[PDB]
Amino acid sequence: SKTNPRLSSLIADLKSAARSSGGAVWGDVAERLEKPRRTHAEVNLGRIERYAQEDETVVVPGKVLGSGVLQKDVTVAAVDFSGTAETKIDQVGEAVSLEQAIENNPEGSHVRVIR
Amino acid sequence: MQATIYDLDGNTDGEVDLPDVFETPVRSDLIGKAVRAAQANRKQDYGSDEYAGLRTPAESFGSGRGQAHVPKLDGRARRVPQAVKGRSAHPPKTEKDRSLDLNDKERQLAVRSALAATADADLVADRGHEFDRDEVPVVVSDDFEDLVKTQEVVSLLEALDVHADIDRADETKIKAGQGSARGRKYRRPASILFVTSDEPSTAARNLAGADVATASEVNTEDLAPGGAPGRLTVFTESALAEVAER
Amino acid sequence: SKQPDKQRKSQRRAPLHERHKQVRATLSADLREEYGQRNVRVNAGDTVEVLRGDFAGEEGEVINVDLDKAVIHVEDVTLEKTDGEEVPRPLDTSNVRVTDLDLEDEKREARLESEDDSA
Amino acid sequence: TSKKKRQRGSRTHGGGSHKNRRGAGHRGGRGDAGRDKHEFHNHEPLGKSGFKRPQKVQEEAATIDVREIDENVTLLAADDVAEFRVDVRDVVEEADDADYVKVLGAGQVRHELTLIADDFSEGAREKVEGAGGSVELTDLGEERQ
RNA sequence: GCAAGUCUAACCGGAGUAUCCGGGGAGGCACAGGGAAACCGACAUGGCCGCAGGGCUUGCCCGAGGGCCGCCGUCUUCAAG
RNA sequence: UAUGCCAGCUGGUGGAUUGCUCGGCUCAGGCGCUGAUGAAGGACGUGCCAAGCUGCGAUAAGCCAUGGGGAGCCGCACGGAGGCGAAGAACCAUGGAUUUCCGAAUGAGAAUCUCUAACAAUUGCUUCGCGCAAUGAGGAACCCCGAGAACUGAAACAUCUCAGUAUCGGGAGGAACAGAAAACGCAAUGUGAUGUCGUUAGUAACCGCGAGUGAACGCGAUACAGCCCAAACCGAAGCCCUCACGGGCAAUGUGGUGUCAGGGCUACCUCUCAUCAGCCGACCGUCUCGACGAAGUCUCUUGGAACAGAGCGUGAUACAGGGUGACAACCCCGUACUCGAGACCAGUACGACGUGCGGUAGUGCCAGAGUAGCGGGGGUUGGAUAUCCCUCGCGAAUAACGCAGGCAUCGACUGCGAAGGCUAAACACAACCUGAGACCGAUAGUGAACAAGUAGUGUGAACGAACGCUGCAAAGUACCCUCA
Ligand SMILES: [Cl-]
Ligand SMILES: [Mg+2]
Ligand SMILES: [Mg+2]
Ligand SMILES: [Mg+2]
Ligand SMILES: [Mg+2]
Ligand SMILES: [Mg+2]
Ligand SMILES: [Mg+2]
Ligand SMILES: [Mg+2]
Ligand SMILES: [Mg+2]
Ligand SMILES: [Mg+2]
Ligand code: NA
Ligand code: NA
Ligand code: NA
Ligand code: NA
Ligand code: NA
Ligand SMILES: [Sr+2]
Ligand SMILES: [Sr+2]
């Protein structure tokens, strides 16, 4: 039983999208976010660096942390970013919230789920 | 955004920038958590006498006289929990920690989130307050801090169309239950919170349900009585600024 | 204290000199203006007017003042016993109002008039 | 509603037969009782092993992996730039209450680094130099003979 | 909630004076392990499968997580295991 | 339909329930010794009528003074009679008077009385006379010094554990104890009296190496404060009693010097501002107590009663709480603001008197013995070779020396001077004062809201209940009939 109202709306949004638009990643991300917090992702830059490719939004069904180096110009969408992750990322790419990703890409196309 | 400033007559006297904090996403779960902690942390440890019911050499005859093996003394049962005058099996204990820890970051995020709830007239109206404005919080000239008479503040609140909320609090409730036997016979609605910066407004504090606070130490409970976000606030131009850095 | 039990206790167990204040009554409008006080310690001799009981409306002279039970007897404010004898029905000074004062005592009079103590 | 709260009416509160939740017999003894008999399974076996050197004759080195130093070069703008030069002793936390600072070779060195520490590992050197870097021992580091 | 960090304890200052606001990182746990000890000190990825999800010209690619291996540190070691 | 069954009704019995709280329980702050000048406790008295409680002591619910207070009063306790008070009573604060007997109990004895001047007994001083003094006993716990279990855990049990606990003996104070290094040993070009709190840490160490037991240095805080002798070199330059005279003490050393920034002596330099002795003597703050203290008792309705409903109005640096015939900021107490007093902080801080700091050179002049240390036997401890202590035995050096740095010896290195002493503050407790409460609400909460340690049980040690609620006002039932 999530207690955070925001995480709760974000989930309702992801669903509305996956159902209305051609989403599936969004419904897949909502699925995981509905599971308990220990299962949510905690990803450091190093991993996003190792598997991300330009022109393919990285979607982390959790929170992005700041260990390691990110040089690729990638747009990372996540539930949250640590103050440092958002900073290190903005230097080479763009950090956006899933609320925005669903906004520009309700069809959830050209995306890479990273955990 | 921008917030309109008011002179002690109720007329607009320019305006200033509403600090970013007031943009903090209102978070009622974190707020209620913070308020839950403050309330618990002022509760007093208690518990019954450790020896209550134990002051007796009462013993149990055991088998033999057609009676249950209950400790008796002078023919009366004693000590045991099922005995009238017996000890209390699992009573309240002084040793119990009745406090609640709250990570400073989680708490500060709650104070900021509560601050933000203040700038939402809809939220404020939802919480129950009775006012007739569109802009809230209500910002006032620093000279507000110089008012001395309570009624000088009433006029200003009527001029600001905020006095109705005080009319709301001007109706105490006589609670149901024994609280009254322990001095808790009354309770009244929470109304306007005045946030100044130099000193708590002695002029406003006696107003029905009014709470006075200073910008450097105004807390979650001030901004959200009982964990309910969106209290009808009235900041002082200077207080508004100091609050920006909490 | 703020706790009810104590509040009542101090009232119920107050020494005698501290009981004079339990027999104080509000002063009439004229008398308030004349002595800068809102109320006064009801004395045997003062004239008072009942503002609340079954006798509200009536006026008479204060015949007795009991600090022990903190009540007063006012002329004609009485009850009739079964044998017919007419006995006084005690009044609480907060249900009464002083309209005329007895100032035969140089001391009392000086007190009311002074600005400091509120006789 | 919690488990506890649902117990009224159950009689045994989950303990099974009411002849169960009594004294220490139901636990097979108090504390670790039976650790070498009935409740012997999953217990460090009985024994006495090794020895300990006196605490004031022990040395606690402060260590750091090249990977940590490398991943933060640019970030360490307050630590020299030449043909980066870094005095580890000024990087590693816990360096005060430590006998000496050692650089370990875990990870990659994607820069030309000139490192200054009291000690390095064979692999730490190989990596730093292999990147056109150098390694310099402190004077304390002179205790390497 | 915060995140390669995280939390302060005693206590200090303020105040609306047991609440609360600020301060305090001593110290704890985590950030490297193996070895009784001396001492030594690691994969920011090299290969193959492949779930979800994405892409495409609708079987074909990309495939986090996961799976099977490689290799790396150390202890024991004539090596090896 | 008798005896009778089931349910209800009316009335009992009973006292649950609801509502109420004069009592509890817990937390917090403050404060903290009494006694031979006879305490604490107890007995017996003491009132117009008086059994219990409370008070008091043959001056007996009281006497006197100063201040406060005030028209009323004569306790709990609402009766009757009578009295006191403007000669200012009651009541409150402070100070004083009186204060039977037993009681440490002290002239001797004794179940609270008796018998023929009494510090009994043990001490110090001593005019060697009880002449001047001391001890005794009490106190809620806290504190210091000694004596010291077992149930229990180990699933038995002996070491171990429970536990240096329960309990016992002795003793101090308002706090105790500790305390200015023969320290530490993050080993150092480092720290710098002692408690305590947080941590170091369930780490090191212990241990049928089982169960279990269990520090320290350091660090962060609290609070901070350092000094005095013995001896050397001086040698009566001195101390106590007494108004004095005079007496007592003291060469077996009073008094000066000095005390590891070693000191003393000799010779110089310079200087005072350290220290030590003593004088004056708070601010503020905290706790409690007290003075002052705004504004409706307006209308209509209901009611036995308006604090209710409806309407009109007001204060607020005061909308805490209580009282008042029902829900009260404005009827009464009080509450905010402001002010005063006492206590504690504290005979402290500051200020001031006196004193004199320190440094150079020479000088083997001085520096705590059954000690340091070793062995036999024990206890205790985390202390393991390396804890602390007791007991029996043996037993050193002299600063050019000695001790410590977790086995012993020798050297080096670093630290430090034991075998004499004092020492504020920060910390424990809760009798006592005040405050507080998501505590209980009369089979609860104290054993005790009442007669409560009461009534009552036991030879005694000891044990030990139950009992709260008329009404707005006693208006607490006149007169009449019946009836012994
Ligand atoms: Cl990661
Ligand atoms: Mg009980
Ligand atoms: Mg109820
Ligand atoms: Mg007057
Ligand atoms: Mg077991
Ligand atoms: Mg056993
Ligand atoms: Mg102590
Ligand atoms: Mg065994
Ligand atoms: Mg040590
Ligand atoms: Mg009872
Ligand atoms: Na008892
Ligand atoms: Na507690
Ligand atoms: Na006291
Ligand atoms: Na004598
Ligand atoms: Na009244
Ligand atoms: Sr039998
Ligand atoms: Sr009385």
Ligand SMILES: [Sr+2]
């Ligand atoms: Sr009475």
Ligand SMILES: [Sr+2]
């Ligand atoms: Sr049992």
Ligand SMILES: [Sr+2]
């Ligand atoms: Sr076995």
Ligand SMILES: [Sr+2]
């Ligand atoms: Sr540190």
Ligand SMILES: [Sr+2]
């Ligand atoms: Sr923090």
Ligand SMILES: [Sr+2]
């Ligand atoms: Sr993998």
Ligand SMILES: [Sr+2]
């Ligand atoms: Sr000091």
Ligand SMILES: [Sr+2]
């Ligand atoms: Sr010495």
Ligand SMILES: [Sr+2]
């Ligand atoms: Sr050695």
Ligand SMILES: [Sr+2]
């Ligand atoms: Sr009963």
Ligand SMILES: [Sr+2]
């Ligand atoms: Sr017997």
